[PDB]
Write a sequence for this structure.
């Protein structure tokens, strides 16, 4: 059902050194629909060697030190190809990761949009070169150079397979870096198709290299590679710790875009059905596999009863089916491992004394696949595992509040800090919550809309740094000051012996 | 001679919890001239707790979330007191770390300059708040808020005691952070005087806290503290690895400003005496204890012989003495441990077959103190320890080159990448070298001028990140996007329940 591709190293299709493979499991049927290479340390070494050789080739005039206008042409051309292959790519995305077709089509528009946005950033880089720095001494002059950081290691998750890859590839390429992409072993199909798009577009050999494989066998040697200049990582807090620990012996820079347990605070002065839809979107869209999921609902006590009943009616109305089926609004979760973890979180919540308001069972009409009904859990306590840990399934927990200070304390009662949301008709209250909730992104009267134009990132256990936005390219650039002594006078610090 | 201070926690002078002290060793006389608190994990905990309580007090309205213009007044008040106390601070700096008085005096001007630059940055921050972001959908609006990252841990070295502390304190405070400074156990005197200035200017309690002590006893608990939001570190590559490994289980962000082995490339088309002075300044000033030291001279074969002869004439003319003595141009090195480490680098070079062109011994006229003559080592080989490793003494190594490709390969033949320099009458050649040398700072026709207006940092084993410059305040700020749905239409992704 999916293409049979190899690893992409030095602009050519390369089989894995050890000849091992991993299955492509369809989450709707539980069947193997293909295979991806099982990359190892030798394959990573080859991809890093190719990225290194491409960066230094012809003093870097073919890519790295070439004008931004040149790299922008390949970026815009990759975006044109993704739009051209949109139905096949969205279908492969739904087949590989389980997300509804409508979500996967949205993802493909954003992939091209992100390549387009960063092509403009590459052209904007030329104007930023040799930027003067005003000094307090007329005897000196200063200018800034913004050079590619070098060979970058890009490690991504399975929840937006091609989009997560694009978030790192598009700015890294725009900056003039050469890269090694290690996408998730759970969803590598569309990334291998991007490799085909690059080959088809004639992207210079070795500029983008793709090594598929298991986290410990392909990800870990890439993260710890002595010849990788920077690691840009997106994944769990658990893996983020290993990524930073692997970089420490080489004082190697990293960016960490990790998990979350984001809150949504819904006040009593809302349009109930509008607030309910955004709460369901904030926890159930992407099949609940949202890094920024507003997975803790903080609902005002005055409307809680009515709100909870409206949520259950909307949740029970969500069409759960094969992601390729018309009108699908909930697909299966990515894999068996993920499904079992979500099952365990749900049973632990029941054991701890929580109430399953709705869901927490397989949908009646779907005997096969990693299908889970939209789940709402009430009578939650702050000490429960379900309140503290990232579930990564369509599982929402609910806590009531009576005052604005109780809501802010409960919203910040997390060791994470990726995102947050506030729903209220009171504008001044929305302003207060936007200031007081500790997170990289606060939504007002919504939850989840993520624009390429704005910086994205977490605080605390959600990691550090910001990706995307007008500073997105700067993650892959190194600043060099060039300071010149322009006086013909001797320095005059030391006494001349003559 | 030095003042007797305690730790500075929550606006108070606080003795260390375990009551232990560390001597203040005068490097000129080798004698104990005072004592500093030997802080431990309990003292670090109290400092972090005070910074956290100050950040959160009154919803951050009096500091963290106050306008940048309010914090700017305190940064300007600190700068004015530094100038007011300049001769006494410069004298204490020379007594504590060993640098000549004229250098210590320059550092105090740079301390005040840095606080003034960051006060302007705090006022500029107010203009940057709530910045709009244009979106490709009219149903949404987006603005950016730049908030303090929170409680920050600032760990610094002894080579520019008050200035290194200032490089981190000024932008952190400008951003609205609260901080805990852990300065070096070898030079804590002026940093403790900064705490006295903070008290004098009425800095709100807990905003700045200072815990002195040994690196493993005070530095390490700070770097690994669960309530520290970010660690800004300056020190060796050896320590930098520990800082980053300590932060990893908490996914705690860090910036690392580490060591270097920076090259200076001198072409034949140069005024000899002018290139010589900059070469010596790039390796011997700060008594050779320069992170960005151009410790590797790459000299063109056509002028190498005359260049070495002129370097020896200038070096032998440097007045080596007590840093408080008029005309001092080279003081002793900071400590006995450093003095011994430098002597070992010189003997290992001699043992490895290198030539001691000049110096390499203690001055005959100075019986006491950690004094080492200006040293130049020639007939170097790239396998030698002296080529590879940071010496941190007034010790220069010399390599000859005949081609530009050879000079570039040699310049980049290091696992460091802090800085570099090129000296040549050919401007196009100077530009080629500025592009090819892999480092954060390239000086042209000079070596060492460091302006707080410009970003500063290293590549490779020299660390990552940039301090100072227009982006310096951003190391202490965390961006928050505020994205609002402005449409009166329902989202319309899911279907409203209407089924029978
Ligand atoms: N923008 C963001 O902050 C963002 C976006 C999407 C997802 N996420 C987070 O990602 C997680 C879900 O993704 P996942 O299950 O793929 O996460 P994961 O941490 O298990 O793996 C992510 C990637 O890291 C690799 N990896 C795993 N172990 C590794 C190791 N030891 N060394 C190096 N690489 C290794 C994996 O193969 C994969 O490519 C969630 O926690 C989610 O919140 C964050
Ligand atoms: N801008 C820069 O890149 C820059 C500037 C100046 C100095 N330096 C570097 O600094 C070094 C000289 O300074 P130093 O001898 O004080 O360096 P150091 O690394 O030994 O110590 C620096 C600071 O870290 C503390 N520290 C030591 N061990 C620690 C540990 N285990 N955990 C936490 N903190 C610990 C020390 O007490 C001190 O405050 C040189 O390598 C020099 O190149 C770099
Ligand atoms: Na899959
Ligand atoms: Na001292």
């Amino acid at each position: 059902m999916v293409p049979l591709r190899q690893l992409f190293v030095d602009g050519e299709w390369r089989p894995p050194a050890q000849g091992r493979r991993l299955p492509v499991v369809n989450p709707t049927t539980e069947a193997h629909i293909g295979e991806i290479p099982a990359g190892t340390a030798e394959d990573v070494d080859a991809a890093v060697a190719a990225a290194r050789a491409a960066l230094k080739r012809n003093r870097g005039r073919d890519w790295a030190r070439a004008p931004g206008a040149v790299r922008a042409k390949y970026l815009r051309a990759i975006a044109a190809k993704v739009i051209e292959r949109k139905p096949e790519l969205a279908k492969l995305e739904a087949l590989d990761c389980g997300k509804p077709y409508d979500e996967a089509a949205w993802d493909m528009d954003d992939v091209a949009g992100c390549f387009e946005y960063f092509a403009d950033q590459a052209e904007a880089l030329d104007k930023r070169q040799n930027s003067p720095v005003s000094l307090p001494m007329e005897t000196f002059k200063c200018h800034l150079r913004r050079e590619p950081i070098g060979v970058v290691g890009l490690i991504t998750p399975w929840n937006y397979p091609l989009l997560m890859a694009t978030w790192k590839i598009a700015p890294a390429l725009a900056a003039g870096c050469t890269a090694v992409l290690k996408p998730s072993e759970l969803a590598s199909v569309t990334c291998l198709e991007l490799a085909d798009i690059c080959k088809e577009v004639g992207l210079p050999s070795g500029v983008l290299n793709i090594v598929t494989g298991l986290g410990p066998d392909a990800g870990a040697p890439l993260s710890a590679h002595p010849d990788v200049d920077k690691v840009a990582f997106t994944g769990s807090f658990e893996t983020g710790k290993k990524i930073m620990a692997s970089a420490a012996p080489m004082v190697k820079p990293v960016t960490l875009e990790l998990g979350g347990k984001s809150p949504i605070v819904v006040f009593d002065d809302v349009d109930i059905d509008k607030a309910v839809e955004w709460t369901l979107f904030g926890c159930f869209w992407t099949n609940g596999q949202i890094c920024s999921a507003t997975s803790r609902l903080l609902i005002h006590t005055k409307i809680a009863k009515k709100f909870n009943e409206r949520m259950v009616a909307w949740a029970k109305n969500i069409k759960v089916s094969d992601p390729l089926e018309e009108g699908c609004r909930l697909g299966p979760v990515v894999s068996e491992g993920q499904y079992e973890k979500i099952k365990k979180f749900i049973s632990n919540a029941k054991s701890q004394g929580a109430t399953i308001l709705t869901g927490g069972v397989r949908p009646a009409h779907l005997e096969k696949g990693f299908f889970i009904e939209p789940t709402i859990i009430t009578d939650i306590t702050t000490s429960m595992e379900i309140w503290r840990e990232e579930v990564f399934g369509p599982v929402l927990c609910v806590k009531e509040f009576s005052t604005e200070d109780e809501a802010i304390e409960l919203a910040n009662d997390t060791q994470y800090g990726l995102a947050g949301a506030v729903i209220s008709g009171d504008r001044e209250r929305c302003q207060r919550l936007s200031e007081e909730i500790d997170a990289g992104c606060i939504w007002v009267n919504c939850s989840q809309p993520c624009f390429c134009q704005a910086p994205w990132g977490g605080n605390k256990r959600s990691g550090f740094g910001r990706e995307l936005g007008e500073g997105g390219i700067d993650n892959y650039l190194s600043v060099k000051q060039v300071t010149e002594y322009i006086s013909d006078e001797p320095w005059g610090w030391y006494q001349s012996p003559s």
Summary: The longest helix of chain B spans residues 101-128.
